Paper text:
Trop2 (trophoblast cell surface antigen 2) is cell-surface transmembrane type-1 glycoprotein expressed in normal epithelial cells of various tissues. Trop2 and EpCAM are, in terms of amino acid sequence identity, very similar (48%). They are composed of three topological regions: ectodomain representing the largest portion of the protein, a single transmembrane region, and a short cytosolic tail. Analogous proteolytic cleavages were also demonstrated for Trop2 where cleavage at the α-site by TACE (also known as a disintegrin and metalloproteinase (ADAM) 17) within the ectodomain is followed by intramembrane cleavage by the γ-secretase complex.
Four copies of Trop2 ectodomain were located within the asymmetric unit (chains A to D) which form various assemblies as discussed in the next section. Domains ND (Q31–L69), TY (T70–L148) and CD (V149–T274) form a triangular arrangement where each domain forms contacts with the other two. The fold of the ND and TY is stabilized by three disulfide bridges with the same cysteine–cysteine connectivity as observed in EpCAM. Of these five assemblies, only assembly 1 has a very large interface area of 2474 Å2 (average of interfaces between AD and BC).
Numbering used by the authors:
A (entry chain D), B (entry chain A): 32 to 268
The structure:
């Protein structure tokens, strides 16, 4: 039936529409999905944290259990798929987040109010690949990288601000102001999240398990990944 | 090379000992390694987060920037390769960690004291596999996961507490309290770390290739992984 969501396999899809139309929904949220573009980072985080409703013979994580990524959580998303500017956990604990969903203010109680969703317009991606004889020249790197950020992540070439290379560290700087973003353009935060997941081996694409990055045909593997976010307003700590 | 470190490729090994003995050392720490058994998660983190700190062609994050670290950092390890109970970053931020290195207290200053290394005695590995037409035989899947932990990660069978399956979710439940671990046992936290690295396409082995999971010969592809750690003393947030 080929009923699939190529740009998001973290979904459920079934040919049960009128005429058998393939209908799909975001796992963990029941939100709608565009199977021909990037799904917003907030819905993807909800999908990753989704619990089955009936555990059956599965067990559930203890309330006191912890996870490696201490910034990882199940988020609340608005109808357009953006993070709600105020996020909460443990019933009362509450804080504000930016457009990428990173805590930006001191934590408080339910009385906290976040004026707006501060937009992250600048993203630094620092990759440390394992040493290899292929010191692919910067030119060939920018070429496949911008190609990927345009043809895989569907981000527009101006929003790729710059790429750097000093072995064994590759660096991609992304810039997208609200003034430069036409509606229906892919946001840099979503393409950056798809990139982070492709690097770390949990690709969100259909049939792809990770980033099969090949410059001039030689595979390149990344050891360490560090991503920094710069938004319109400085964090208020 | 005859001189390799099969259980840990995050090493440099040279045939420069007496007579040509393969002498190996861990990247990022200089520590000795046992290439017949799994290396400590603390030392492997030191190998993964070693920082060149070069800025000739590279740019540094803005002072106001926030970071998605995945909770990763370069940690302090004791002579036995265990995490030191106390961990610091940015020189002044400091906290306690458990035996798997996860933060189990609120961040403090350089005055913070951690009494002991709290044992992580329970681990839950929740995999979500890429859907297939039919479910795997629960007995065959259970047997393959058990021999995987017995042979590849060299974990004793008694430390695998349970294996759950409810398509498409697989769950592996490891248990190893302080009283149940004799010296020379592989630790469940290390077996879990090697498993997670294998699944994400970053196998730690030097000559076993990679993880190609096969139940009854059918490929098993993990789309999502999540790991939960439970300590013998509840976290003090
Ligand atoms: C999963 O497989 C096991 C292993 O049996 C194999 O697969 C069977 C389909 C068949 O081809 C056997 O010859 C293979 O050895 C299944 O265990 C068997 O169960 C059958 C049916 O009840 C029983 O007659 C046999 O004694 C078992 N086979 C042996 C030799 O262990 C199991 O039932 C399969 N589960 C599912 C979900 O189908
Ligand atoms: C980079 O190196 C490759 C090696 O195959 C070569 O083909 C290419 O022309 C080089 N380009 C530059 C700009 O150095």
């Amino acid at each position: 039936d080929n009923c699939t969501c190529p740009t998001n396999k973290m979904t459920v899809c079934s040919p049960d529409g009128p005429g058998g139309r393939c209908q799909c929904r975001a796992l963990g949220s029941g939100m709608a999905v565009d199977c021909s573009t990037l799904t917003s980072k907030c819905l993807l985080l909800k999908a990753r944290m989704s619990a089955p409703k009936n555990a059956r013979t599965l067990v559930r994580p203890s309330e006191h259990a912890l996870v490696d990524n201490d910034g990882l959580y199940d988020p609340d998303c608005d109808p357009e798929g953006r993070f709600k500017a105020r996020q909460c956990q443990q019933t009362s604990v509450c804080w504000c987040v930016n457009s990428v969903g990173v805590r930006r203010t001191d934590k408080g109680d339910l009385s906290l109010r976040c004026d707006e969703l501060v937009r992250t317009h600048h993203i630094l991606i620092d990759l440390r690949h394992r040493p290899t004889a292929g010191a692919f020249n910067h030119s060939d790197l920018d070429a496949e990288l911008r190609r990927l950020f345009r043809e895989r992540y569907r981000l527009h070439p101006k929003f790729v601000a710059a790429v750097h290379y000093e072995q064994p560290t590759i660096q991609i700087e992304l810039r997208q102001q609200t003034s430069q973003k036409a509606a229906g353009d892919v946001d840099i935060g979503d393409a950056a999240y798809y990139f982070e997941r492709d690097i770390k081996g949990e690709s969100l694409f259909q049939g792809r398990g990770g980033l099969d990055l090949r410059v001039r045909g030689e595979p390149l593997q990344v050891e360490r990944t560090l991503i920094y976010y710069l938004d319109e307003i400085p964090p208020k700590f």
